[model samples]
Target: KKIFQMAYGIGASIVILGALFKILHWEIDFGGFKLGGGFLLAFGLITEAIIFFISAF
Candidate 1:
C-alpha cells in the first residue's frame, strides 16, 4: 500500500515537472555548466524516472 502510494505520488510529480518544463519553456543553463548541463538534465531525468519506477514496484 505504501509503495503504491509513493509510486503514484512520484509519478504524478514527474508528470507535473514535465508539464512545468513545457509550460515555462525552461532551458537548462546550469549557471555556466554548458557540458555539465547535459549531465545535470540527464541525471535529474534519470533520478526522477527511477524514483517513479521504483515506487511502482
Candidate 2:
C-alpha cells in the first residue's frame, strides 16, 4: 500500500515535470511532454504496473 502511494506520487511527478520541461522550452520533446520527462513518465507507468503485479502476488 505504502509503496503504491510512493510509486503513484513519482508517476504523477514525471508527467508534471515532463510538461514543465516542454513548457519551459527545453531541448526537445520526446513525446507529447518532453525528452527526458516523457521517458521518465513511461518508466513510471511501467514501475507502477510491476508494483501492482508484485503486490497482487
Candidate 3:
C-alpha cells in the first residue's frame, strides 16, 4: 500500500516536472516557480523525504 502510494507520488512528480519543462520551453530554468519547476521540485522532495524518513524507522 505504502509502496504503491510512494510510487504514484514519484510518478506524478516526474510527469508534472516534464510538463512544466514543455510549458516553459526552456532548456534550463532553475529558480522560484520557474513557471512550474519550483512547485514540481517541492512536491517531489517532500514526498521522497517522507518516504525515506518513515522507512528509516
Number of the top-ranking candidate, with lDDT as the measure: 2
* Model 3, residue 52: C-alpha shift (Å): 0.2
Per-model RMSD to reference: 5.4, 5.6, 6.1
Total backbone collisions, model 3: 0
Residue 3 in candidate 1, Cα distance off native in Å: 0.6
RMSD of 3: 6.1
lDDT of 1 by residue, 1-57 (tens): 686566656656655655566566665464765333334345556766776677666
Candidate 3's TM-score: 0.48
lDDT of each: 0.58, 0.68, 0.63
lDDT assessment of candidate 1: 0.58
Candidate 2 TM-score versus the reference: 0.49
Assess the local accuracy of residue 23 in candidate 2 as a C-alpha lDDT between 0 and 100: 67
The CA lDDT at 22 in model 1 is: 57
Q: Write the per-residue lDDT of candidate 3 for residues 1-57, one digit (tens) a residue.
A: 678586667757765775676577554545544445555556666666677677677
lDDT value, candidate 2, whole model: 0.68
Residue clash pairs of candidate 2: none
> Each model's TM-score?
0.46, 0.49, 0.48
For residue 6, give model 1's deviation from the true position in Å.
0.1
